[PDB]
From TrEMBL:
The keyword Zinc is assigned to this record: no
InterPro entries for this protein: BCAA_transport, Leu-bd, Peripla_BP_I, TAT_signal
Domain Leucine-binding protein: 3-340
Alphabetical keyword list: Amino-acid transport, Signal, Transport
Disulfide bonds: C110-C358
Protein family: Belongs to the leucine-binding protein family.
Biological processes per GO annotation: amino acid transport
Species per Swiss-Prot/TrEMBL record: Rhodopseudomonas palustris (strain ATCC BAA-98 / CGA009)
Protein's UniProt name: ABC transporter substrate-binding protein
Encoding gene per record: hbaE
Pfam families to which the protein is assigned, alphabetical: Peripla_BP_6 (PF13458)
């Protein structure tokens, strides 16, 4: 029979374009392998999580129990992912996290069957704060949504930014997924920082970018790369000049990215973004696992071990996991110019996030 891959992703709401991009990355990878991973035909069972933490336990349980998923892949929203990972850890099902950066997933909640192909919130926030200090910035206002990802990315940023003698003047938070920003933009203007660090993504990011430009603040906008990835063409000139830090840049010239961009543009007529890459690499990681156990997904201990030691070429560069199952990869400084984020160079060389509390 087919190998059933349960996909828990947002197909509606503000993160719907992220779930679409991840799904596209996975399906394109499965197609590049002739519809099979390690000799098994793939069947995706797609469930919309609606980025809604109150539904996460029920929808995960259904995917594992009622639909009998052989593998679980998800999700985008860190609150949903934390609840999902709690159920997956206790079940033992091979689980791949293709976006959610919740720090706990590769720290205190680290597990033998739980892998991440994206990043950790805290680590990318620290890399962005470091880049802003190197750029001479000293007085920030942060703006994000009131949930674990905003908090952890703003916390990581504040750690590096204050360690660099900068001050964080205010942390503005908006309830998730609200996108009424006029009040935050009036407060930014009143506080006169020399920079703004924002975490938004999907619909929220695109609207924040247009609203932020329409305010004519004269203040540079920064953030983790999720603030611009995927929304460059739609943001138009309002995006110009935004500086971000991310573990992917569309112009990386390694052969795997050039072939991946080609396949993705030929199938979907738009460039891939970081979300598509993370999905493509979840496909590569599951392939490495199913190949090592000759299609026999029931050998979980051996499947997990192979995915932990997996080594392949990502569109990002060499893919490799730490002992706590998080990617070890470079972070680049970028600028949004003319509809794409361009590479301004290396921001942080590849190092393993510190796995505080990980029993592994």
């Amino acid at each position: 029979g087919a190998l059933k891959v349960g996909l828990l992703l947002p197909y509606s709401g503000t993160y719907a374009p992220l779930g679409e991009a991840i799904t596209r990355g996975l399906e394109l990878y499965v197609q590049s392998q002739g519809g099979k991973l390690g000799g098994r035909s793939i069947s995706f069972v797609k469930v919309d999580d609606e980025s809604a933490p109150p539904k996460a336990t029920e929808l995960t349980t259904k995917l594992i129990q009622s639909e009998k998923a052989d593998v679980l892949i998800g999700t985008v929203h860190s609150g949903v992912a934390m609840a999902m990972v709690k159920i997956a850890r206790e079940d033992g099902i091979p689980t791949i996290v293709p976006n959610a950066g919740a720090d706990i997933i590769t720290r205190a909640m680290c597990a033998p069957n739980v892998f991440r192909t994206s990043f950790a919130n805290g680590q990318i926030g620290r890399a962005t704060g470091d880049a802003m200090i190197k750029a001479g910035l000293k007085k920030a206002v942060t703006v994000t949504w009131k949930y674990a990802a905003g908090e952890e990315m703003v916390s990581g940023f504040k750690k590096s930014f204050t360690a660099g003698k900068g001050e964080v003047v205010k942390d503005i938070t908006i309830a998730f997924p609200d996108v009424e920003f006029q009040s935050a933009l009036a407060e930014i203007a009143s506080l006169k920082p020399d920079c703004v660090y924002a975490f938004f993504s999907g619909g929220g990011a695109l609207k924040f970018i247009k609203d932020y430009a329409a305010a004519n603040l004269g203040i540079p906008l920064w953030g983790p790369g999720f603030l611009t990835d995927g929304v460059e063409a739609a943001a138009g000139p309002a995006g110009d000049g935004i500086k971000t830090v991310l573990h992917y840049v569309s112009d990386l010239d390694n052969a795997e990215n050039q072939a991946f961009v080609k396949s993705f543009e030929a199938a979907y007529k738009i460039p891939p973004d970081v979300f598509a890459v993370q999905g493509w690499d979840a496909g590569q990681l599951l392939d490495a696992g199913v190949k090592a156990v000759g299609g026999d997904v029931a050998k979980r201990k051996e499947l997990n071990a192979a995915m932990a030691a997996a080594s392949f070429a990502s569109p990002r560069g060499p893919f490799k996991l730490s002992a706590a199952h998080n990617p070890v990869q470079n972070f680049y400084l970028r600028e949004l110019k003319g509809g794409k984020s361009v590479n301004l160079g290396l921001a942080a060389p590849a190092v393993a996030d510190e796995a505080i509390g990980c029993k592994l």
